């Protein structure tokens, strides 16, 4: 359950793994987690997948209503502020946490957002079950001044660190670039007897 993000020079490479487990059994070996809040902004989720999916749908309808109304593509901080509030109000009944990344003319922002409602932008963030293992690799390896393509070589290995070392997290890496230059979804991205009839 290793989700991650990094703020590279032109934006944010979000990264995710395709697994969701109901405890000790994998129920979904191709789980979509880098949910599209908006074409500009995307949000990975971790913790309970139900809370994360549904809360992301709520903020999606919300953000897409505000941008639909102004006709101006929404800011990242806006997304974060309503997320801060949304995850605060329940006071831990929404126990699923979110890594929002987006770009607005104001440029890149990537806030890890803990399920009690702390929003903290930082150059690297990780979350999920795999986060400890992932963040040590993001700490050791992340450098400011990193380029655009090397982030692909920085989140695929970091998420891979959570794929092997952890047992909640596994399966194909998803990697979703955020830049005003281009958006990229790479849905399945990185791969690291017959019961005879009649």
């Amino acid at each position: 359950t290793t989700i991650a993000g990094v703020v590279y020079k032109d934006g944010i490479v979000l990264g995710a793994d395709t697994r969701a487990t109901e405890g000790m059994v994998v129920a979904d070996k191709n789980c979509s987690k880098i949910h599209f809040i908006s074409p500009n902004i995307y949000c990975c989720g971790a913790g309970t997948a139900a809370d994360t999916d549904m809360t992301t749908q709520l903020i999606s309808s919300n953000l897409e209503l505000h941008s639909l109304s102004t006709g101006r593509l929404p800011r990242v901080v806006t997304a974060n502020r309503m997320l801060k509030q949304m995850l605060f109000r329940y006071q831990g009944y929404i126990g699923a946490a979110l890594v929002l990344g987006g770009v607005d003319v104001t440029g890149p922002h990537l806030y890890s957002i803990y399920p009690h409602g702390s929003t903290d932008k930082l150059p690297y963030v990780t979350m999920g079950s795999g986060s400890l293992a992932a963040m040590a690799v993001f700490e050791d390896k992340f450098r400011p001044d990193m380029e655009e393509e090397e982030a692909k070589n920085l989140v695929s290995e970091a998420i891979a660190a959570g794929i092997f070392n952890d047992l909640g997290s596994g399966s194909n890496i998803d990697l979703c670039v955020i830049s005003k230059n281009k958006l990229d979804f790479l849905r399945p991205y990185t791969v690291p007897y017959r019961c005879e009839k009649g």
């Binding site: 505000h66 102004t70 800011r75 901080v77 806006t78 502020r81 309503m82 509030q85």
Partner: protein, 195 residues
């Protein structure tokens, strides 16, 4: 008939136009000019947000209710989103609640034209008790509003506004009579010019 907001046989709300006539009988004559770099307003100056101001024009009492509503919404914006409400969004929302007066027959249109100024470049929105809002380029609202609009159409920004009020109300002012508010590119802080 002409008392409860309902449509006339001409498809025309009587109480709404009565509110426009009430704005004209408020006796004030506001003008604003959108320069490239500055957004003069002149007349009742208000500071709806530290980055946004507006001048109400009409019934004096009526102005304050919508001023407070504008501050309520402007503050609530930042509370849910976290950036200055655009001038367009603020004018849109206040217009949307002024329509409530019109949709409901219980309560009555507040007669105050609302000339917002502020930089989202510079903006000069109008709002009517109708619930209609639009960005002008050089608005005026008030008594001699039509006589000013010609002079605006014919058309340094501060000069445009001040000579417009001078020529159009046909009176040479004292500085206390003309309250003036500027919002320069470098000064998004709403500020009374202070000629």
């Amino acid at each position: 008939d002409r008392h409860i907001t309902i449509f006339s046989p001409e498809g025309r709300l009587y109480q709404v136009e009565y509110a426009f006539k009430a704005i004209n009988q408020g006796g004030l004559t506001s003008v604003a000019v959108r320069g490239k770099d500055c957004a003069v307003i002149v007349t009742h100056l208000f500071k709806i947000t530290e980055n946004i101001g507006c001048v109400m024009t009409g019934m004096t009492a009526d102005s304050r209710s919508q001023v407070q509503r504008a501050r309520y919404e402007a503050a609530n914006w930042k509370y849910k989103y976290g950036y200055e409400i655009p001038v367009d969004m603020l004018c849109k929302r206040i217009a949307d609640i002024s329509q409530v007066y019109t949709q409901n027959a219980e309560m009555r249109p507040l007669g105050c034209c609302m000339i917002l100024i502020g930089i989202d470049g510079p903006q000069v929105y109008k709002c009517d008790p109708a619930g209609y809002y639009c960005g002008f380029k050089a608005t005026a609202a008030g008594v001699k509003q039509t006589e000013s609009t010609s002079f605006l159409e014919k058309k340094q920004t501060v000069e445009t506004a001040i000579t417009c009020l001078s020529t159009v109300l046909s009176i040479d002012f004292k500085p206390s009579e003309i309250e003036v508010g500027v919002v320069t590119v470098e000064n998004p802080k709403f500020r009374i010019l202070t000629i």
